[model samples]
Target chain A: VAGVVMMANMAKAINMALHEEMERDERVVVLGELVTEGLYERFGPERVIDTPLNEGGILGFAMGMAMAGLKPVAEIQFVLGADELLNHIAKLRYKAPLVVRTPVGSPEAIFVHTPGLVVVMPSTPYNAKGLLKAAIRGDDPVVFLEPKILYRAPREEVPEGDYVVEIGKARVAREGDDVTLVTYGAVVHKALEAAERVKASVEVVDLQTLNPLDFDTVLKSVSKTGRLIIAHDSPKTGGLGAEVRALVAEKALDRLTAPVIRLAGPDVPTVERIIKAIEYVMRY
Target chain B: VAGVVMMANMAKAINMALHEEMERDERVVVLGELVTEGLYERFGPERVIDTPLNEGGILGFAMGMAMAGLKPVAEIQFVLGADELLNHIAKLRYKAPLVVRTPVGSPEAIFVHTPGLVVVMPSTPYNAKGLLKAAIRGDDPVVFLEPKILYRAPREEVPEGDYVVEIGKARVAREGDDVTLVTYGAVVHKALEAAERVKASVEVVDLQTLNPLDFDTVLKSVSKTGRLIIAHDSPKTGGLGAEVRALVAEKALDRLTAPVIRLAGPDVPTVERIIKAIEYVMRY
Candidate 1:
């Protein structure tokens, strides 16, 4: 489906990707909380396993199948499930190259890690399809984070199955010169809005893959823009913003015209409110 | 030992206060994971009850006991446990007064509610004992957040007393000018460190209580300093910083020379790292 520009939202795009992958490979197994209801009906129970509420239990089960060379894709209800699996998650990479999908809201933003882990967060239907397909195909474990708020936000033209949007790459959502606004997930849209209204020339960077982040793009943009602002829906402390800012500070400190600041949020909000927050910070 | 100068940190200080309250009031009971190990030896199993590894169940049991007029104190392994109990915590206010303790690396930073629910965050044992006692005795329920990083950090001379530090009060750690730095929990120490490093005169306002925030203290400082910075060890999105900034922006927008910037964290790591994050933010 991804080979053609088809109008669809993330849900349809994601569904199409999962179905396409499942049909294409016997190793591709879909499992998780309610992932069975819709998927189980399309694909049999063996391929679409439905486990109990215990996250760690399901994770270990998926890991077992995956370690045996079966490609298992898992989903969870909330971030809390992941928090409970924190210690377990950091050790998961060596076990299997499974794909774990979870919804990230405003709460439970623990911030960061590794498990041979590549964190892919997609904002639009197009990237969601491409990135998810790439994650399923990748050799390392991938934690694919889907923004809950944007599940139904808007539709985008997406090319269907088989095509891959290479992971560890950053997409330039908007291009400008004075300030570089870096963000991902649903908040990338907000950064785009701020970029448009603000007087400063703003370049918006959408980091689809969080872990193994596309720092090359971030650095290149920061080196050019000098001023950077990271906006996310998560809290600022351990939020993705801090890490992105840290990366910029480490690589391009001398290139910065002003101190970097992050507009922490999307997990909670009004669009206009966030737009203003980003504008005010960029204005300074 | 507490009435006089006996060195204690937040952990021991909190334990001693729980012991004192349990001994004084027959209605007082304690529960939560690992809590039994600390106080169980002293108070015995009757008052110091132990629950399974369920935050919601533990909360429900505590809520039941409290509704029957018993003052129950519960501890949770994760903040999400209490976060799940927020709906119940606010409801418990109508039920009865109780105290719940948990770690707060990140604040769900529950943005709103009127539960007469006190959120007590102590930076030192000196205030830990006093404020804890106050929270335990209050007419409404209390959500006590204990900073895990400060559990055994250091000992401070604490007053061994039955007296309680009144709720809804702000403790000014270092009085200054130029910028007002507002904070709570162990992060207050971060603010103190930033104050020392920064060139500007910074006033560190230790908001000992979060729910019934000392807006009076915050307003007074903002009125004078014009610039405000709120720091918490949580994500900044719905973080304490965002809330405080919103309050100031709404009431005192005309009083500022520059945009109010939040130091953005104590929630993540080494004090030195956090100090730098704050130092960078405060410089703006």
Candidate 2:
């Protein structure tokens, strides 16, 4: 059984997991964006290298390194600066393949310590530790998206020794018969909270991988629930929520009782417009 | 009556026409392209000046010159090279109102004496003199596509010191009404030849102006004949023929008994594919 504790010890737990993984695996290498002398002395330049200030170019360069058989972990300070990377990311699948890990959305400090790639915003610390180990050992390129806000909010007792959470698999957080709340990252916690307040049982599906989406799990959940509510932090138009909506419409249209409900922000620049943000989220 | 003349002195006829127009009207100004000598030196740079190698830039620049109370006669050598100037010509109606006089289609010495800005093909000197004089005094941009093959062929007596062929009009070269052949430039000569061989009672409509297409004349002839064929020397797809086809479909859809047939070159780079180009126009 997974054990839950206070959120205060999240950073200590994450640093311990990262240090242990680096010591165990020879292939693992850590790279930092604007890393200081303190980090360089502890991790060493061979394992941790300071990258240039260009966030977009850094991602592209890391992708090249990954393709050439090197494990590179890149860091960006804020999710808002991702627009520059989005330009090249849009053409990645068509031109070349690359993987990028970014921390997105805000959660409690304890949740952020879950060291993993690809925006892995675990609502609980147990899942975070399990996923972080899995990301380090996996073969394909992955981005361990940690929640920055949840770096040290609480502490939870994870399983002893080594364990792994399978990639390209999603878990149903809350069992709901009416509508399946499909989400990932920090919004998953928000979705769970929202589900508790509503009378209908909300099936909260945590999408572990965004690129190679676990459609089988998603379709099965949607089939059981009959209705879908996709919640994401990205904008409404040309966002991940739209992709989920389209997938349901294409594969499970006949089984759908109601139209896929997408809860997302307006198609505007991601700067926090307080009034606009409230109106967007509160609309549906 | 309009007459066809084949003059041995083709360049002299061209220079004479330019000289006569300048003397008759104070508004006419001759502009030379990529030249250090010829008309500019003879007429002086104030009247006849040299322009840069950019076809589009020169056309727009000339348009500004015309808007400021001057009728600029811009000469673009080698009609094939004038393809670079199409964008300027196409947007002239919206950007700047001006006339673009160019000698296009086949290198011929007779190109020097053409009366119009746009000369497609002059089969004989008689047609050349009448069309050349008409273009000089016309208000709109006139492209004089000339036939270099007929430069020194022969000469016919001219009764006119000065004359005018009304703009926005078409000439019925041959008087059969079974199938209407609408064309301009050097293609006109080929259309007449094909009509003669088929004995199809085809009335050849030699289009003088392309921008303000004489759709009234085209529709009138097509209404009687019920069959229409558009022939041109440009590419088949997204060319002048396509525009004409769209116009016919929009304005006179019900009047057309047979589908409008277009005969033009293949939409390939016009550099080395001469055989394919020939086949494209010959198919229809």
Q: Which candidate comes out best when scored by TM-score?
A: 1
DockQ of every candidate structure = 0.08, 0.02
**Per-residue lDDT of model 1, residues B163-264, tens digit only:** 777788997899987778788888788778767876777799999888778899998887887766667766543355655665554355556555566655
- Candidate closest to the true structure, highest lDDT: 1
DockQ of 2: 0.02
Here the TM-score of candidate 1's chain B is: 0.86
Error of 1 at B112 (Å): 14
**For model 2, what is the alpha-carbon lDDT of residue A185?**
60
Weakest lDDT window of 10 consecutive positions for candidate 2 chain B: B106-115
Per-residue lDDT value at B141 in model 1:
73
Provide chain B TM-scores across all predictions: 0.86, 0.68
